[PDB]
């Protein structure tokens, strides 16, 4: 069902499609729905081979690796496959502005960063869409989440949970965020960390 | 945001069906050698390294994580990546995620150190050359008289 | 006068020719030395001596494999520690061990990260307090009013040492991760629920005298962790010092005074050798050069005189080693 | 006359040392003033543009905006005044010495507590004022001659990003997505306008002109007596909106039933944030991060001509010549400044 | 346009620590680069010339030459590339980061065994190359990206003192008074030229522009792409030569001295061609403007520097990517540099 909804959302906000465009879009949605939870590189390669075999068997196209598919609406008026270097330059300038405006952090932009912020973007563009980011510390999780939320015009709420805090303070923070979201229509991105539980 | 998947509390979050059914799981994991190489190449492209002779080594392809080695910078990046892997192997981290924090911090320290060291080296050499020229000129003047 | 000046400067000419010859080798080994020192600084802070040696072996294997020349006689203290730093640290009360010198150099050369001090003997609190004098402010995560005192210290610009590091309070995560906001010519950080100004004269040290404590994964990956654990050399040195102090304090005082005076003399000699070259480079001369030369010979003569006691102390050391070993 | 449309290629290309943050046109002579992220300030003759006429580094950080004015003294000698605001938390006033072709600083204005982001200059009978907004959420009014402040009001919750001045009224956009019109001398808010989903980048009045033009002609005799009806805004929302201002109770007073704007038209077609807007006759020009300049028809609300890939990077600012004023003759030229450290000039 | 002539006084006066040995001009911005005997490199803003934009001790001995280039990639971001050679036996390749107004050392070129004299830069479709000559009588060619040499040859029994590059052909002037043209990629001598009685100081091609010598004579020369060249030596004489067409992998034969300019009181140091005229500095503290058509001196800037006048720079007028601005800079032995604008 998630794959179906993703395909519909991409088509409804996309340009005139062709068969190759449709197949690449379907492959990108399959990647995001299925293979983002995979841990090992071996499993990812097996999934790529599975995609190739499925396309050959049922739907007889370029290279459909994870980094070879870059669909985004950040560079145009509609969801479409974008070029890598244009996205890199756009993200670099946007991040310069973001550092100058919110928090100065010397971040170096690489390809996996671009991919991760693209998928965080597609997740925050949905309705009732939430994230669970899993990775080593100091891999840019919170920074990228804040950057993408800033791009989409969300309001960031990091709970100020510290030592000597209890259920009342967390409840107050949650109630405040909920009340803002409802009575003030403040679209909010709540960042809950494992150290806050 | 989850740093340690195997914690007592974080595994409870990942297991919790209320969260697991609504959330979208994005297993960022840790950095691969390609991301490491890109970051290192970007950081060490502003420091004076290629100021000396360099004979390109002959090493196995799987030991090379960058493009084929042509200059000192590629050697430095490969060395840093290799040492990071070896250090995390010896310290017996196991399967626990490896933060790239040591790698990044080492890169920044290397830049900040190479700059000053190179500047000091050339300034001292210039001072020595000027002193030698002064002594030779004085000797020539003495021989004149 | 000219001939005498040339004859006096013949030694400087010899040194300068030697330096000119060594320039190529120094430039060839520069990058390898810098790589080794940086890795030593960012990885070896939380390893004992054996692990440091093994990792140096691995790193030197890697450097040799990729054709990056380095100093075969490399030594961290020689490369990254100056005489002034050694004198200041020793006067502040640091132990005389080489391991403590390396760890202090690691701690004092971290302008970006916050040094975390695992010091079970609580010696480094006193050492740092002596180093920074009046600026030092002592706090701990286990007290009340901690947040307000920290805000006052940040605003004013004190040097802060927070004890009980195993009880980290995440209310200072912005200070830990250096997530500031620049407001024109002002720098603001959000501690608690309100922004404060960062003076720029403000440093942070986290101290904990509890090995096998607990460091949250947020804090561990953002601090420079340094261990101050006693080793064989420190125990032997302390035992010998106590034995000599309780046996014959005259030799003890004489040895200490000679050591300190010799260190001062070598520092002054280095300063003179630098100043002579600067005087030549900034061009009267025939007078200042001779004055500096005479001062250099006087200091060298005093240093040569001061070396007539060291054999006695070596004999004394050989006479007392069994106590240290046992 | 006024239906001049620029051609497909610029007639000049100016190279500078940093990103161009603001550009301006001399209202009398063929001269262009250019600002950069280094805080420099250039001046290029429009026929020999390979060397600047003069340069000046007065600020220590990036210049954010600038504006010019040719003084019209009715009984003194006229000259050109240039005002630049930067992230130095300061505003510097310059005088352009034409015969020697040099800049001449006059004074600096202090008092803002954070990044100043806009300035404006206008002249009354024989008075000159300066308006400025900054991140401290304060809009200040200054006296050109005395040099000290005359008013200071805070009309927004977020920080004000842009302003415009028409007589005694100042309309301001902010980092919050809301517009607001206040009466300057009394410092009282009059009406607000919402509808944008991203911070406001530009905002300015649509001055009345004699001719027919859709939004440049009054609707009631009350508007004729009040002198203005419509305003235009640009935001990071990739949209340009035309608003119609409600009439206040003339010192004015906010009518509670009529204290909100009314977006009468929304222009879409840009691919990214819209950075600047300018109005000439029946056309509205705009530049955006998509490396392009649009030209909209005010009557039908359509995009008549597109200038794709004019710059290799973001297009920071435009500048056309004011046409609604009699003292400024609307010459046929416009200038664009971009992130690629280049400025294009269209002539004739 | 191309007929601009400098005024009788310099618009700017720049003071440095030591004798100025080489001066270059930023192709796009009003910035001048200065190198001295102390190995220090300077970048001066042409409107605030009391403090350098940046400064840098690049070498440990005197700098002997330098050259600049604005890269033009058809795919990457373009930037200015600065290359300097000194008596350190090393060549340093810098990069001008206009965003921060500072230098950026990229790499260094090594292999010459004794003091280097001159350097050159040029760009192919997407390839950037460097050239050099030294007292060890070797001419080396380098790849700007990889950094290692691509060609080496010895075109003179004595040591080369000046070179210039045009396509695939390089002409070198030695301490021995003979010039010589060689074919770069294959390293084949094509012809020589004699007639000077003192060591050469400079040599450069004359490029075809749309003038007496800048226009091809025959169709075969048009196909070849060059006909003439100029050189100046301690003979106090500037000579315009003619390159005999080779046996076109070219195969080899004498340079015909079809003109000679005299009048300088000392050694002619540097030359530069701007459209019709020709500019030349010399040790007699003078700068001369020579009409290429008549071959006669037009204007003289006497007593420009107290000491020798070392080098001149003018914007290239024959390149589609270098707009020929109206300015020139003169570097002198007296720790001063003169700038003429408009
Ligand atoms: N691409 C990168 N370049 C530089 N530093 C990076 C990069 N990615 C992560 N970091 C480092 O990670 C930290 C910021 O990431 P952050 O989101 O705060 O970490 P996490 O969310 O994993 O706890 C900084 O220390 C920063 O230097």
Residue numbers in the entry:
A (entry chain A): 2623 to 2682, 2686 to 2822
B (entry chain A): 2890 to 3034
C (entry chain A): 3291 to 3573, 3582 to 3624
D (entry chain C): 139 to 213, 216 to 351, 354 to 392, 397 to 494
E (entry chain B): 139 to 213, 216 to 350, 355 to 392, 397 to 400, 405 to 494
From the reporting publication:
The Lis1 protein is conserved from fungi to mammals and is a key regulator of cytoplasmic dynein-1, the major minus-end-directed microtubule motor in many eukaryotes. Cytoplasmic dynein-1 (dynein) is a minus-end-directed microtubule motor that is conserved in many eukaryotes. Structurally, Lis1 is a dimer of two ß-propellers, and Lis1 dimerization is required for its function in vivo. Structures of yeast dynein–Lis1 complexes, while not of high enough resolution to build molecular models, show that Lis1 binds to dynein at two sites: dynein’s AAA+ ring at AAA3/AAA4 (sitering) and dynein’s stalk (sitestalk), which emerges from AAA4 and leads to dynein’s microtubule binding domain.
To enrich our sample for complexes containing two Lis1 ß-propellers bound to dynein, we used a construct of the yeast dynein motor domain containing a Walker B mutation in AAA3 (E2488Q; herein referred to as dyneinE2488Q) that prevents the hydrolysis of ATP as our previous work showed that this state results in Lis1 binding at both sitering and sitestalk. We also added ATP and vanadate to our samples as this is converted to ADP-vanadate, referred to here as ADP-Vi, which mimics a post-hydrolysis state for dynein. In our structure, dyneinE2488Q’s AAA ring is ‘closed,’ which is seen when dynein’s microtubule binding domain is in its low-affinity state, the linker is bent, and when two Lis1 ß-propellers interact with dynein. Binding of Lis1 at sitering primarily involves the smaller face of the ß-propeller in Lis1 and an alpha helix in AAA4 of dyneinE2488Q. Our high-resolution structure also allowed us to unambiguously map an additional interaction between dyneinE2488Q and Lis1 at sitering that involves a contact with a loop in AAA5. Lis1 binds to dynein at sitestalk using its side and makes interactions with coiled-coil 1 (CC1) of dynein’s stalk, as well as a previously unknown contact with a loop in AAA4 (residues 2935–2942). As suggested by the continuous density in our previous low-resolution structure, the Lis1s bound at sitering and sitestalk directly interact with each other. The ATP binding sites at AAA1, AAA2, AAA3, and AAA4 are all occupied by nucleotides. While our map shows ADP bound at AAA4, we were unable to resolve whether ATP or ADP-vanadate was bound at AAA1-AAA3 and chose to model ATP into each binding pocket.
